[PDB]
Amino acid sequence: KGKLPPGPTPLPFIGNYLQLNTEQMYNSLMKISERYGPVFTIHLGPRRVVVLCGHDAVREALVDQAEEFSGRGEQATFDWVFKGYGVVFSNGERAKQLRRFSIATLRDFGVGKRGIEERIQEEAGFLIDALRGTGGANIDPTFFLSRTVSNVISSIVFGDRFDYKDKEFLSLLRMMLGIFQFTSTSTGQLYEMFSSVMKHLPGPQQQAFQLLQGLEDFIAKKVEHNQRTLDPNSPRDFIDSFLIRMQEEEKNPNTEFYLKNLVMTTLNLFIGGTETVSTTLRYGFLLLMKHPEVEAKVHEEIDRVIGKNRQPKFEDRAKMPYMEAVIHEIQRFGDVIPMSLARRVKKDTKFRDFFLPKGTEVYPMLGSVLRDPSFFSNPQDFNPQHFLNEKGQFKKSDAFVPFSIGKRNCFGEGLARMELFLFFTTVMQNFRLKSSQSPKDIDVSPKHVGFATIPRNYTMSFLPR
């Protein structure tokens, strides 16, 4: 054919806005999909975007044509602060250099090794202390979980953890929570279409920008301090390593290693390494309370494999297929980043029988893959069996793509999985979960869905086992 995937006819500037509900972008797009097919074109305001629904379409593009779909598209709210700098929301050589450096440096600081495993186990011990500190009282688990998760990536990028009582630490965590929420609201999704006008208007979006600026200012301040105390021969953290590279690249006019990329890359890792794992833990505990039978089976496995005294360790996962299936099912059901981070084609592309001109933005609908009816028997239910065969052994799925896939896939995946396993296992070894309401009445549908999937606010109690 040589034409763009088909889709609803757009109007000048507003695009397909009148055919979408900003409060329910995923549903709006899936509905349109029913009429046009799994691969179609939508206009988010002036942004022409090719939407990919279901496993095959997503894998065929992002993996079978990985290089062609390896460009980074827009996320207007994050782009407000990043402006094309840093490692996530950037493109070309800049992204390429920053990604190679970040992965190497994260490994240098223990990621994927015993070094970060020990860091996570230690922070998990501090979480257990904090939960015991509540005395079994009903509490909002939100910041208990985020403080613990954030301290892992914080020890890597800033060299030391934050004290749980540090008020500024709480403030940064509120900024992250607030920005993920804003991007998942109707206004945050309206912003994705009309940022050209909205970035200049009063409104909720301005408060969101101020939370991003607050996070940026905090990182700039930390960088300054490291700068004046830096030992080129003994880096303390991610920031020092980057400062050293900047030093070594000072004679290169075209280097990507300069202050703005240092600040933005560090900001990407601080927010990235915090909010998504935190949200997943929070959703996870809610699902476990909605499903006591699953919690009960987790406890049998933990007591048998690990016991009551030693701390869980990452190698324990190989002997714990049920917990591994449970964590996969939480990520599959949570669908935390439902439309991934937009990609864009690097050059003119032929995909299936369509034509995608260079620069065209792409929405890989991860959530449509995680709930693909050809890969999961009951996609709309929380059921760990989705990841187990008949002998209760762990069974992988090609449709398990919460970290996306391809050339710009999440390089925080190994760290995330290690955190999820050790935090879920250590909490559940130590506590049984008590909801403030009957399981039948627990509502696990999300509170907001847009850029992220946000669970409803809730309180619960952690009772020692």
Ligand X SMILES: CN(C)Cc1ccc(-c2cccnc2)o1
Q: Site residues (CB under 6 A) for ligand X?
A: 78, 88, 268, 271-272, 276, 337, 341, 410, 412
Residue 296 and residue 298: Cα distance in Å, rounded?
5
Is residue 452 a contact partner of residue 184, using CB atoms and an 8 Å limit? yes
Binding status of residue 71 toward ligand HEM by CB under 6 A: no
Mark residue 227 as left, alpha or beta (left: phi above 0; alpha: psi -120 to 50; beta: remaining): alpha
Site for ligand HEM in 408-437 (CB under 6 A): 408-412, 415-416
Contact 336, 321 (CB under 8 A): no
Helices (H), 134-185: 142-158, 167-182
The nearer residue to ligand X, 241 or 268, going by C-beta atoms, is: 268
Q: State how far the Cα of 345 lies from the Cα of 363, in Å rounded to an integer.
A: 11
Site membership for ligand HEM, residue 272 (CB under 6 A): yes
Segment near ligand HEM (CB under 6 A); pick from 9-17, 247-255, 398-406, 443-451 = 398-406
What's the distance, CA 392 to chain centroid?
Answer: 28
CB 53 within 8 A of CB 370: no
Q: Angle at which helices 167-182 and 142-158 pack, to 10 degrees?
A: 110
Nearer to ligand HEM by Cβ, of 85 and 194: the residue is: 85
Binding mask 313-352 for ligand HEM (x = CB under 6 A): -----------------------xx--xx-x---------
Nearer to ligand X, 125 or 446 (CB): 446
Q: Are 157 and 239 spatial neighbours (Cβ–Cβ below 8 Å)? A: yes
Cα 372–chain centre separation:
20
Q: Please state the closest distance from residue 27 (CB atom) to ligand HEM, in A.
A: 19
H-helix or E-strand spanning residue 416: helix 413-430
**Binding flag, residue 277, ligand HEM (CB under 6 A):** yes
Q: Which is nearer to ligand HEM, 198 or 212 (CB)?
A: 212
Rounded CA-CA distance 407/185 in Å is: 29
SS3 52: strand
| 87, interface contact from ligand HEM, ligand X, none, CB < 5-8 Å by kind | ligand HEM
Minimum distance from CB of 409 to ligand X (Å)?
10
Nearest to ligand HEM of 15, 367 (CB atom)? 367
Q: Does 119 bind ligand HEM (CB under 6 A)?
A: no
Kindly write out the interface string for residues 359-388 of this chain, putting x where it contacts ligand HEM by CB under 6 A and - elsewhere.
Answer: ------------------------------
Residue nearest to ligand HEM (CB): 412
> SS3 of 274, please?
helix
Give me the least distance between CB of 213 and ligand X, in Å please.
Answer: 12
Annotate 250-278 with b (16+ C-beta within 10 A) or e (fewer).
eeeeeebbeeebbbbbbbbbbbbbbbbbb
Q: How many residues bind ligand HEM (CB under 6 A)?
A: 28
φ and ψ at residue 315, rounded to 5 degrees: -65, -15
Residue 36 or residue 216: which is nearer to ligand HEM going by CB? 216
Taking the least distance from each CB to ligand X, the nearer of 188 and 272 is 272
User: How many other C-beta atoms are found inside a 10 Å radius of the C-beta of residue 413?
Assistant: 12
326 binds, among ligand X, ligand HEM, none (CB under 5 to 8 A by kind): none
Single out the residue of 38, 273, 338, 450 in contact with ligand HEM (rule: CB under 6 A): 273
Q: Which residue's beta carbon is nearest to the bound ligand X?
A: 272
Q: Closer to ligand HEM at the Cβ: 5 or 412?
A: 412
- 271 makes contact, choosing from ligand HEM, ligand X, none, with CB < 5 to 8 Å by partner type, with ligand X
**Amino acid symbol at 217:** D
Position among 94, 99, 236, 395 found at the interface with ligand HEM (CB under 6 A):
99
Tell me whether residue 53 is annotated as binding: no
Edge-to-edge strand list for the sheet holding 39-44:
39-44, 47-52, 361-364, 343-344, 71-72
Would you say 162 and 151 are in contact if contact means Cβ atoms under 8 Å apart?
yes
65 binds ligand HEM (CB under 6 A): no
Phi, psi of 409 (to 5 degrees): -70, 165
Contact yes or no for 99/411 (Cβ under 8 A) = yes
Cβ neighbour number for residue 283 with a 10 Å cutoff = 23
* 170-209 positions binding ligand HEM, by CB under 6 A: none
Roughly what angle, to the nearest 10 degrees, separates helices 321-334 and 292-305? 140
Chain positions 232 to 271 lying near ligand HEM, rule: CB under 6 A, are 268-269
Residue among 25, 50, 88, 208 that touches ligand HEM (CB under 6 A): 88
Closest distance of CB 293 from ligand HEM, Å = 24
Nearer Cβ to ligand X, position 88 or 208?
88
Q: Which residues are annotated as a binding site for heme?
A: 410
Residues of this chain that bind ligand HEM (CB under 6 A): 72, 87-88, 99, 153, 268-269, 272-273, 276-277, 280, 336-337, 340-341, 343, 402-404, 406, 408-412, 415-416
Q: Which residues are annotated as a binding site?
A: 78, 268, 410
